[PDB]
Amino acid sequence: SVGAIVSIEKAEKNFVITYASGKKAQISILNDHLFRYHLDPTGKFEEYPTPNDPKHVAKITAKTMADYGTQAFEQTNVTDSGNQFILENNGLKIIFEKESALMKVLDKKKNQVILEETAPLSFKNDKATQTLKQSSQENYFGGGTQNGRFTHKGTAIQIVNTNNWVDGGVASPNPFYWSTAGYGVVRNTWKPGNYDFGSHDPQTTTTTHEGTDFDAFYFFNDSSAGILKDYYELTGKPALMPEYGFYEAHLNAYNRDYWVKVAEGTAGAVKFEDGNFYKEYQPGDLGNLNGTLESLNGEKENYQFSARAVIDRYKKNDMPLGWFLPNDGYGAGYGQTDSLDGDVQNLKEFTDYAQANGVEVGLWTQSNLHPADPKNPKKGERDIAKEVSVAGVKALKTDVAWVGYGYSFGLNGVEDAANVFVKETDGAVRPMIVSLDGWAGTQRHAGIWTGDQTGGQWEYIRFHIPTYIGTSLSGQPNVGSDMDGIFGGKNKEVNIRDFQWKTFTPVQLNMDGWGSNPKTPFAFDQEATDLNRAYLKLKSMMMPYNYSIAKESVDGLPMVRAMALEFPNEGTAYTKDSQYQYMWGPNLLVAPIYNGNQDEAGNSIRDGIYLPDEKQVWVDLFTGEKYQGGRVLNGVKTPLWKVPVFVKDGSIIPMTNPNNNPKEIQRDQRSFLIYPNGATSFNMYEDDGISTSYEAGQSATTKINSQGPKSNEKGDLTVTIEPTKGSYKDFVDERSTTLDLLASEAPESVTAMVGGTEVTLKQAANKEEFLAGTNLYYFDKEFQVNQYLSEASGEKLNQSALSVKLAKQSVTAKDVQITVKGFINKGTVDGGNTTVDDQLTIPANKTTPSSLTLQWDQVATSYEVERDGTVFGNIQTNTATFDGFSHTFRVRAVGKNGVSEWSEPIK
Numbered sequence: 032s033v034g035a036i037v038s039i040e041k042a043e044k045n046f047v048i049t050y051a052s053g054k055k056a057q058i059s060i061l062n063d064h065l066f067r068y069h070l071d072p073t074g075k076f077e078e079y080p081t082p083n084d085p086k087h088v089a090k091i092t093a094k095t096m097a098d099y100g101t102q103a104f105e106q107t108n109v110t111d112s113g114n115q116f117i118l119e120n121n122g123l124k125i126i127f128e129k130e131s132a133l134m135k136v137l138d139k140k141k142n143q144v145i146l147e148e149t150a151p152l153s154f155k156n157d158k159a160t161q162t163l164k165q166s167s168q169e170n171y172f173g174g175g176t177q178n179g180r181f182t183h184k185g186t187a188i189q190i191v192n193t194n195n196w197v198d199g200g201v202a203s204p205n206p207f208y209w210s211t212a213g214y215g216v217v218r219n220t221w222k223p224g225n226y227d228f229g230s231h232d233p234q235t236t237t238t239t240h241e242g243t244d245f246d247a248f249y250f251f252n253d254s255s256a257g258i259l260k261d262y263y264e265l266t267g268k269p270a271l272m273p274e275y276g277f278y279e280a281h282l283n284a285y286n287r288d289y290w291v292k293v294a295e296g297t298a299g300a301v302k303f304e305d306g307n308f309y310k311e312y313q314p315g316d317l318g319n320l321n322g323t324l325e326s327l328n329g330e331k332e333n334y335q336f337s338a339r340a341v342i343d344r345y346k347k348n349d350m351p352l353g354w355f356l357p358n359d360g361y362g363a364g365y366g367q368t369d370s371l372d373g374d375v376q377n378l379k380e381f382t383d384y385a386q387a388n389g390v391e392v393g394l395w396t397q398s399n400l401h402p403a404d405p406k407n408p409k410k411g412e413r414d415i416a417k418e419v420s421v422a423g424v425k426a427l428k429t430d431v432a433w434v435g436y437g438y439s440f441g442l443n444g445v446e447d448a449a450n451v452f453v454k455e456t457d458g459a460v461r462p463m464i465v466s467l468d469g470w471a472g473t474q475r476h477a478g479i480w481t482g483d484q485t486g487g488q489w490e491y492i493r494f495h496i497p498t499y500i501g502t503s504l505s506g507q508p509n510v511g512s513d514m515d516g517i518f519g520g521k522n523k524e525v526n527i528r529d530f531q532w533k534t535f536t537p538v539q540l541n542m543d544g545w546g547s548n549p550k551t552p553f554a555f556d557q558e559a560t561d562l563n564r565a566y567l568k569l570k571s572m573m574m575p576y577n578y579s580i581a582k583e584s585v586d587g588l589p590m591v592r593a594m595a596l597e598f599p600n601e602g603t604a605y606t607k608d609s610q611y612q613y614m615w616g617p618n619l620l621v622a623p624i625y626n627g628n629q630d631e632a633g634n635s636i637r638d639g640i641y642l643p644d645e646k647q648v649w650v651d652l653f654t655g656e657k658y659q660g661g662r663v664l665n666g667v668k669t670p671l672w673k674v675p676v677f678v679k680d681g682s683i684i685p686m687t688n689p690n691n692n693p694k695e696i697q698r699d700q701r702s703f704l705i706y707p708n709g710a711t712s713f714n715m716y717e718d719d720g721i722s723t724s725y726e727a728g729q730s731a732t733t734k735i736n737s738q739g740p741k742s743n744e745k746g747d748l749t750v751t752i753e754p755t756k757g758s759y760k761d762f763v764d765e766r767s768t769t770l771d772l773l774a775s776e777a778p779e780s781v782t783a784m785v786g787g788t789e790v791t792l793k794q795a796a797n798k799e800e801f802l803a804g805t806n807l808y809y810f811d812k813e814f815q816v817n818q819y820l821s822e823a824s825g826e827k828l829n830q831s832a833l834s835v836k837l838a839k840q841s842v843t844a845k846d847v848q849i850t851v852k853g854f855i856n857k858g859t860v861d862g863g864n865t866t867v868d869d870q871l872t873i874p875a876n877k878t879t880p881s882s883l884t885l886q887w888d889q890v891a892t893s894y895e896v897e898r899d900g901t902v903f904g905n906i907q908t909n910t911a912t913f914d915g916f917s918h919t920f921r922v923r924a925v926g927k928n929g930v931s932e933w934s935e936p937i938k
């Protein structure tokens with residue numbers, strides 16, 4: 032081993048620790064809350080760990096140690112205090128016991144010990160292991176894409192390039208974890224590892240990587256946003272996707288296969304527009320069969336089998352479509368010429384057709400992106416420089432066949448590809464790369480998709496929700512996956528539920544040609560197709576809210592937010608009670624349907640809807656039905672048309688007109704859906720949607736403020752839109768403004784100031800008059816947040832809103848202030864009254880490996896059971912089952928006038 036510390040000297044640029052064994056480590060102070068520790072037997076102490084291949088030159092760190100400056104180091108002292116050596120500055124006391132050589136860190140502003148070694152660094156069996164104290168309330172996140180998982184206390188996770196895309200695998204590892212205690216750690220290695228968060232000993236956390244040295248960055252911070260910002264300053268801020276990357280893509284090969292005319296009901300038969308059924312054959316599987324060769328452009332008596340025909344199908348079905356990959360398949364290619372240049376020209380023609388239709392082109396790549404000889408290529412080589420500058424390609428997907436060796440391979444490849452898009456375009460195209468097999472740093476270039484799974488199975492949704500949440504907790508906000516899987520299909524219900532929740536996620540890939548049916552939003556019956564569209568249109572309408580939380584994700588909280596990120600004071604937000612839900616940015620709680628459980632009316636039964644905060648009203652997005660938080664709801668009846676989504680009362684949600692791609696967005700309009708509740712605020716981000724210029728200041732922000740009464744209360748409402756700050760290519764200064772304000776009664780008065788001058792508002796007599804004029808207001812009892820969903824579901828889904836339209840104005844030179852007297856948005860709050868009812872009798876009076884069921888005698892319009900101090904409600908009968916254990920059970924009844932006293936604790 033290492034032995035006692037004999038000494039810690041302040042050398043020129045770092046602190047040099049000398050151990051009894053003669054082994055040395057360097058501590059580098061980078062800022063007042065971040066330090067590198069490196070124990071290097073070699074004594075070389077090189078800046079960068081050795082990659083898997085010398086040609087791998089992409090670095091884990093995006094900022095060199097020298098770019099952090101010497102100041103923190105200058106303001107760090109080393110003292111000998113008898114039993115300890117101590118390094119101290121304004122941020123950190125870093126304390127080493129001399130004999131044991133154990134390190135602990137005190138965070139000075141908190142005046143707490145955040146990190147404590149409980150056993151020394153071990154180098155046994157060509158592995159480098161740290162051992163840390165784990166506290167009873169300490170929770171852990173990170174590791175990258177940890178398939179099926181986000182919260183790691185009491186578990187071990189593999190920091191391994193597993194190439195396992197299902198539950199329990201790691202699609203994209205990251206040697207980065209953090210503690211709720213207030214520390215994050217990056218291990219400065221390309222080597223695989225294993226982190227054990229007290230799987231067996233719950234007072235001990237061990238972190239192991241293969242190899243012979245120990246190199247790590249420790250950062251301390253009092254907020255989850257600050258931990259990620261530290262990881263981001265260190266390894267790279269996430270890339271901001273272009274607008275189009277938030278829209279569903281279509282991925283398939285259209286250059287390779289043959290379609291053969293077959294009987295309806297033949298296995299793999301697809302109906303085409305000519306009324307006939309065809310089966311697809313790879314050229315190797317065709318044998319003696321007669322079929323039609325596909326092409327990208329459908330120029331060879333083959334149009335319905337083309338890539339263009341798919342773009343035409345998305346248009347005909349009125350489905351949003353952002354981007355298209357037409358070479359996604361093994362040996363597919365993107366042309367049928369005798370040359371790379373011939374092929375690039377065929378791709379260019381497909382790109383012009385796609386762009387005419389508002390769709391961008393990407394390429395899949397199973398290989399290196401450059402010819403052997405760039406000036407003299409071969410047919411069937413790749414040339415990303417030409418694909419980009421001749422053919423106009425803007426996006427890339429990295430197949431496992433390219434990046435599958437993991438670790439340094441993927442980051443080098445993605446760093447390379449990203450640099451090519453920006454240089455070849457002079458920054459007119461920002462990177463849009465979807466990858467996997469990532470590492471620390473990947474997020475600065477690429478988002479991830481979760482790989483190959485089977486859809487049309489509820490497990491496809493169940494495992495994916497925590498997958499998304501953990502990837503985002505690991506400093507990768509750009510996360511996505513196949514729409515209903517690359518394999519399987521034939522389950523309408525699962526197909527509908529997949530589109531539903533992926534509305535509130537970054538990247539949606541229609542990964543076509545391997546499944547039990549085509550992979551499109553229109554693969555099922557009219558009902559599925561009409562719900563799919565409703566939910567894709569809702570995403571398109573939410574694009575201003577979506578883009579603003581994406582900008583926030585570049586240097587802050589990710590877009591998919593673990594409940595703990597938005598409610599850090601609630602135990603429930605940190606555990607598996609939060610594994611199947613999340614906040615989509617600040618304002619929406621998404622609790623997807625993930626199983627086939629139904630009542631006798633055919634609705635899905637949704638158990639375990641965690642609504643945080645006992646003081647907070649939650650509003651059903653679609654219906655307006657209000658719910659009180661501090662509770663987990665069981666038995667929430669969800670029909671097929673619906674996915675459980677609740678607005679945080681107080682929310683401001685920037686919206687736009689429904690659209691099928693970014694060029695259909697009306698840039699001379701702006702719209703705000705608002706749920707006034709005290710004083711709330713939003714920062715709307717925007718830029719040119721496509722270039723690197725956002726990195727060089729070419730963006731604008733608009734700050735919106737709602738200053739209204741409390742949930743369900745009457746008062747003055749003042750909505751303010753502050754002057755837009757910043758500019759960018761094709762910025763539109765002149766815009767008309769809509770406010771939709773959820774309200775239960777017609778208001779007393781509505782006035783407006785624009786840049787300090789009144790604007791006379793007339794009251795509309797009807798919806799038609801309101802939607803035709805401006806400088807108007809209107810109390811609308813038939814306000815439909817999503818008309819497509821009203822019409823798909825067969826419900827009106829009418830809410831009451833106060834809607835306010837202002838004429839076009841300069842958003843840069845003039846603010847907006849709307850004032851509403853007699854503003855109220857009131858409905859009955861479910862679980863609104865938790866006050867003891869004296870007149871309600873306290874409730875009177877199947878075990879498996881870990882599923883306890885509890886029963887009692889019938890008082891009460893429902894009951895509530897407290898399960899280890901967590902309140903489960905909406906229990907509509909006299910039994911309830913609690914599972915997912917390795918516990919205590921107080922119940923109470925619920926009448927029309929509050930609850931009963933809690934029964935005594937049962938075990």
Ligand SMILES: CC(=O)N[C@@H]1[C@@H](O)[C@@H](O)[C@@H](CO)O[C@H]1O
Nearest residue numbers: 359360361430431432482483542
């Ligand atoms: C993990 C992975 O690479 N999956 C891909 C799948 O997404 C697709 O690109 C397919 C070719 O159509 O090849 C697979 O290798």
Ligand SMILES: [Ca+2]
Nearest residue numbers: 284285288325
């Ligand atoms: Ca094909």
